[PDB]
Ligand binder design. Structure first.
Ligand SMILES: C[C@H]1Nc2cccnc2NC1=O
Ligand SMILES: [Cl-]
Length: 348
């Protein structure tokens, strides 16, 4: 079966063209709808189609955001079109996205089940690209709100990483309140658990730190029973937050009645084989005080990733590393001076 739709390019001008695809099969699910895999008749290239029920009255936040983005470390919106569904009054938005099958989650699971550790070189590669993609979106004031291993797609051969699933993403506006119960639980920042509604894109940074730790440990670092137990799991490592730290998180409620627990030193949290740079970076990601956390750009500048800036660095499969230094002014906006560190001599 060959299907044809009138679809508008994602980043291109607003002019619909005919698009044909075949080999359609379901590969994903969610409250939003369904996700298909298909092959374009033109390029024979594989693509994901995210199908979301559309409230014809309101605009789709994910579409808006997706159309603005153009980055190597973000899954790009090829096309979008509309279709019919069930009732005669229902309209579905379809997002035609890059198809990348492997995920940081599956990759990390293979290692975890083999009682093995993911080689630090990959940790650096993956985390660096994640921080770069976050630096990009944050420069637009856009927060992802769902950073987790499942949302990090991997090309196993090039070690290119791409951020996906902007269904929870939003452009944060100082003054306007945001929902607190957001993000996947293990990767949920502490302020969110405190019911904060005036939070910043630094919640993504917390999430990223959770991913790093998980990759270093072989399992989630804060595996909470629930949204509230999530805080207990956190406390059992960072120790009870101080009254000032709690104040910083902008709480809607603090009546938790948590028992007094002392911090567990980072060096003790990880395997002894763990590089200090990784521990050091982690400790400045997972901080109670939101403003105390590194920005993605600073994180990219961290020493943990120095090896990546070495002119001789190579992928374990012998190939060259993906392009990591081709920054744009947009990307460096939050702190241009960092270019000195981010863009190395040999790269210029
Ligand atoms: C939406 C997200 N889904 C997906 C699943 C498997 C492979 N690639 C994908 N691309 C995506 O954007
Ligand atoms: Cl490789």
């Amino acid at each position: 079966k060959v299907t044809t739709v009138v679809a508008t390019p994602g980043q291109g001008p607003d002019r619909p063209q005919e698009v044909s695809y075949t080999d359609t099969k379901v590969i994903g699910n969610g409250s939003f709808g369904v996700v298909y895999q298909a092959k374009l008749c033109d390029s024979g290239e594989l693509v994901a189609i995210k199908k979301v029920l559309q409230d014809k009255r309101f605009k789709n936040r994910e579409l808006q955001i997706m159309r603005k983005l153009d980055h190597c470390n973000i899954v790009r919106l090829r096309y979008f079109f509309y279709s019919s569904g069930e009732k005669k009054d229902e309209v579905y938005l379809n997002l035609v996205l890059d198809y990348v099958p492997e995920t940081v989650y599956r990759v990390a699971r293979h290692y975890s089940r083999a009682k093995q550790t993911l080689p630090v070189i990959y940790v650096k590669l993956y985390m660096y690209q994640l921080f770069r993609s976050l630096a990009y979106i944050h420069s637009f004031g856009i927060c992802h709100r769902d950073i987790k291993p499942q949302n990090l797609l991997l090309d196993p051969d090039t070690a290119v990483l791409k951020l996906c699933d902007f269904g929870s993403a939003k452009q944060l506006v100082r003054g306007e309140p945001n929902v607190s119960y957001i993000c996947s639980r293990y990767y949920r920042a502490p302020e969110l658990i405190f019911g904060a509604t005036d939070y910043t894109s630094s919640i993504d940074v917390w999430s990223a730190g959770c991913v790093l730790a998980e990759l270093l440990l072989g399992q989630p670092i804060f595996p909470g029973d629930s949204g509230v137990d999530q805080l207990v799991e956190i406390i059992k490592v960072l120790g009870t937050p101080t009254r000032e730290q709690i104040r910083e998180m902008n709480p809607n409620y603090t009546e938790f009645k948590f028992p007094q627990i002392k911090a567990h030193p980072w060096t003790k949290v990880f395997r002894p084989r763990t590089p200090p740079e990784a521990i050091a970076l982690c400790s400045r990601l997972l901080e109670y005080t939101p403003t105390a956390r590194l920005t993605p750009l600073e994180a990219c500048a961290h020493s943990f990733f120095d090896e990546l800036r070495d002119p001789n660095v190579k992928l374990p499969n012998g190939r060259d590393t993906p392009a990591l230094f081709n920054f744009t002014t947009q990307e460096l906006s939050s702190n241009p001076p960092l270019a000195t560190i981010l863009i190395p001599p040999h790269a210029r």
